[PDB]
Design a protein around this ligand. Structure first.
Ligand SMILES: [Fe+3]
Length: 197
C-alpha cells in the first residue's frame, strides 16, 4: 500500500539478491501478504531523517527509502518500561518492514531498520530469532558475548546465533542497518542485564 513502503520493499528485494550474506540467510519468498500499519512517530525518526552523516558506498537507495517510509512507519518502542531512559528511548530507532508491525507479513522472515545516532550505547540484548545485521550507513561497534568486537561499516555484517547476547556502541558516527530474522519471530528482544550494565 503506501507507496513509500512499496519502493522500500523493492529496494529490499534487490539487495537481497545482490548480497550473498542476505540471500544466504534467508530466501525471499516473493510473496508477501499486505497488512495495514498504524503509524507511530518518535523522535528517533526525526533523528534518522535529519542525520548528515549516514555515509555510504553502495547502499544509498535503500537507505533513502528507509528514510522515506519513516513517515509512515510504526516506530517501535521496545524496552519501554526498563532501566533505559529517555536517553535511550529517544535515540534508538527501529521499525518493521517484514513482520509484526510492518506493511508485509511472513512466516519465514522479518526485516527491520536500526538507526542509531552517535554517542549511543545499545546494551546487551537477546532473542530467539537468528539474526543478521547488514550495515547500510555509517559505522558502529558490534559487541557479542565471547567474541572480539568488530567495527562495522557498510556492507559489513554480523551473525547472531539464537539467544546470543549482542550490543552496539556508536562513537562519533551514526549507522543504519538492515536486520533480518529467521526462526522464532514472535519473541521480542530483551535486555541481557535488566538490572546491571
Ligand atoms: Fe538483535
Amino acid at each position: 500500500t503506501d507507496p513509500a513502503f512499496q519502493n522500500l520493499l523493492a529496494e529490499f528485494q534487490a539487495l537481497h539478491a545482490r548480497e550473498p550474506a542476505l540471500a544466504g540467510f534467508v530466501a525471499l519468498p516473493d510473496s508477501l501478504t499486505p497488512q495495514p500499519v498504524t503509524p507511530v512517530r518518535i523522535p528517533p525518526a526525526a533523528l534518522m531523517e535529519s542525520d548528515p552523516d549516514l555515509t555510504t558506498t553502495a547502499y544509498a537507495a535503500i537507505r533513502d527509502a528507509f528514510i522515506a517510509a519513516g513517515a509512515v512507519a510504526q516506530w517501535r518502542l521496545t524496552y519501554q518500561g526498563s532501566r533505559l531512559g529517555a536517553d535511550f528511548m529517544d535515540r534508538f530507532a527501529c521499525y518493521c518492514l517484514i513482520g509484526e508491525g510492518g506493511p508485509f507479513a511472513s512466516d519465514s522472515l522479518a526485516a527491520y531498520v536500526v538507526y542509531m545516532p552517535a554517542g549511543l550505547y545499545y546494551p546487551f540484548h537477546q532473542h530467539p530469532a537468528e539474526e543478521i545485521y547488514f550495515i547500510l550507513a555509517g559505522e558502529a561497534e558490534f559487541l557479542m558475548e565471547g567474541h572480539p568486537p568488530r567495527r562495522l561499516g557498510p556492507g559489513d555484517h554480523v551473525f547472531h546465533p539464537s539467544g546470543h547476547p549482542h550490543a552496539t556502541r556508536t562513537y562519533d558516527r551514526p549507522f543504519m542497518a538492515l536486520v533480518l530474522w529467521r526462526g522464532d519471530l514472535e519473541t521480542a528482544p530483551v535486555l541481557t542485564y535488566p538490572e546491571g550494565e
